[PDB]
Amino acid sequence: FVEMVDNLRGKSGQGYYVEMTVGSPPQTLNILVDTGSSNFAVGAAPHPFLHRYYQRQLSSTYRDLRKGVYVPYTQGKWEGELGTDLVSIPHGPNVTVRANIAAITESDKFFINGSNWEGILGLAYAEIARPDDSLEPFFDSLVKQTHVPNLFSLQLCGASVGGSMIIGGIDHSLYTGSLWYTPIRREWYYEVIIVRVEINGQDLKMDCKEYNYDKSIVDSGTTNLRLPKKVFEAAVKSIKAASSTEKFPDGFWLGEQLVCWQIFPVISLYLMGEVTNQSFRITILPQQYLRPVDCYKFAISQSSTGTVMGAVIMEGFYVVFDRARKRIGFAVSACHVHDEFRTAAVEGPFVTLDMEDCGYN
Ligand SMILES: Cc1ccccc1-c1ccc2nc(N)c(CCC(=O)NCCC(C)(C)C)cc2c1
């Protein structure tokens, strides 16, 4: 999978995108890689922020589904017109798939001014696709129509960002040590179960249900580590404690301020393993959750929809979305940023009882 190496670009905080083609003849677009959504949606109108857009009138293979779709978010939205067309990934597998495409015709606070992408590739499952789960997501269409294996893996290496999306396989050059797998609890988001959290080696001693209150997901579309409020409150209280050599205001912890200088504690997440009463832990450095924006912001925030393992987690690990076996693999990434005193790590096995009780119902 050599030519798929380094097929991801982007800017800090603006997500990772991959090059794709749509229609016949092929129209090239940069498309965000997003494991937290399930729609393949592309700009189709000359929005002033867009470098380019889907021009359906130029594609002989375009087919109109004659149905709109409306996707609101927190004060933002995009909406579009559903259709199908031929889709390829130039630095991916050598195949061409007919996939659903949502031609974005109206949006608000969706496209980013100054960014270099024009659409979004939802890699999650049909259940959270809009308008309903009958709109087959792209990767499902890819797997059904070709012999590409039902998995993909992501190495996000956080000016410009870089990374690799390996469609249908695993490139063992992109990680060190062994892969450790956590089960996909349910196929809608990429939902997983955190069973224990440690700050600098010290457990938070919270009922593990809180770590997954509502849910916990793996999301390449989210920048930060998003923890439930009560877990976030307890998490920052511990990170605050080990960080007494230097005192910042309270608002900096809620995402309100940056400071440069031109000692922090490591965060450990224990994930449910593949075997009863067996878990493993992934540990990230300060180089992950303190994102430069030599200045840096604090990239851990609270959430209402559960835990979100975003780029702060994924940029330290090679992550394997093993859809065929309903599991997610983690391994130390060969590109993660680390000093010479501490390293990102994936360790196991550990003994953890009542891991199923950690999931919310
Ligand atoms: C921010 C926003 C504004 C207008 C339209 C869409 C978006 C949007 C697009 C894709 C997203 N993809 C994501 N993975 C996320 C974060 C995770 C999340 O809440 N997913 C829920 C489902 C859905 C992504 C809203 C469809 C938020 C997103 C927000």
Distance (Å, rounded) from C-alpha 227 to C-alpha 209? 12
Task: Collect all residues with Cβ–Cβ distance below 8 Å to 93 and sequence separation of at least 6.
Answer: 142, 146, 148, 167, 168
CB 33 within 8 A of CB 161: no
The residue assigned the tokens 């307890």 is 234
Q: How many CB atoms sit inside 10 A of residue 266's CB? A: 19
Experimental method: X-ray
Closest among 68, 123, 70, 128 to 99, alpha carbons compared: 123
Task: Single out the catalytic residue among 108, 219, 322, 357.
Answer: 219
Q: Does domain 16-148 have CATH number 2.40.70.10?
A: yes
**One-letter identity of residue 276:** T
- Rounded to the nearest angstrom, the distance between the alpha carbon of 37 and the centre of ligand 1 is 6
DSSP H helical segments within 243-310, as ranges?
Answer: 286-289
- Rounded to the nearest angstrom, the distance between the alpha carbon of 218 and the centre of ligand 1 is 13
Closest approach atom of ligand 1 to CA 39? 26
Distance (Å, rounded) from C-alpha 202 to C-alpha 242? 10
Q: How many CB atoms sit inside 10 A of residue 102's CB? A: 29
Omega before 349 cis (within 30°)? yes
| Whether 85 is catalytic | no
| Whether 34 is catalytic | yes
Distance (Å, rounded) from C-alpha 17 to C-alpha 220? 10
Tell me whether domains 16-148 and 149-361 share a fold: yes
Q: Token pair of 71, please?
A: 């996707």
Closest approach atom of ligand 1 to CA 109? 3
CB 177 within 8 A of CB 26: no
Alpha-carbon distances, residue 114 vs 10, 12, 14, 16 (angstroms): 11, 12, 9, 14
- Per-domain residue ranges for the chain? 16-148, 149-361
Distance (Å, rounded) from C-alpha 134 to C-alpha 361? 25
**One-letter identity of residue 196:** R
Task: Collect all residues with Cβ–Cβ distance below 8 Å to 186 and sequence separation of at least 6.
Answer: none
Distance (Å, rounded) from C-alpha 86 to C-alpha 98? 4
Closest approach atom of ligand 1 to CA 71? 5
Distance (Å, rounded) from C-alpha 161 to C-alpha 231? 30
> Atom 13, ligand 1: which residue's CA is nearest?
36
Closest among 126, 127, 130 to 139, alpha carbons compared: 126
Q: Token pair of 54, please?
A: 């889907």
> Atom 5, ligand 1: which residue's CA is nearest?
77
DSSP H helical segments within 156-273, as ranges?
Answer: 208-211, 229-242
**Partner residues linked to 347 by β-bridges:** 281
**One-letter identity of residue 26:** P
Phi, psi of 4 (to 5 degrees): -85, -10
Chain breaks in the chain (C to N over 2.5 A) after: 158, 262, 293
- Rounded to the nearest angstrom, the distance between the alpha carbon of 124 and the centre of ligand 1 is 11
- Rounded to the nearest angstrom, the distance between the alpha carbon of 31 and the centre of ligand 1 is 14
Report angle CA 302, 316, 173 to the nearest 5 degrees. 155
Where does ligand 1 bind, in terms of residues with CB under 6 Å? Answer: 34, 36-37, 71, 73, 76-78, 109-110, 120, 128, 219, 221-222, 305
Question: CATH classification of 149-361, choosing from 1.20.1640.10, 3.40.50.1820, 3.30.70.260, 2.40.70.10?
Answer: 2.40.70.10
Closest among 122, 166, 169 to 141, alpha carbons compared: 122
> Atom 22, ligand 1: which residue's CA is nearest?
37
- Rounded to the nearest angstrom, the distance between the alpha carbon of 72 and the centre of ligand 1 is 9
DSSP H helical segments within the chain, as ranges?
Answer: 138-145, 208-211, 229-242, 286-289, 311-314
User: Which residue from 32, 40, 73 has its CB within 8 A of the most atoms of ligand 1, so it is best to mutate?
Assistant: 73
Closest approach atom of ligand 1 to CA 78? 5
CB 192 within 8 A of CB 356: no
Dmax over CA atoms of the chain, in Å, equals: 64
3-state secondary structure of 217: strand
CB 220 within 8 A of CB 311: yes
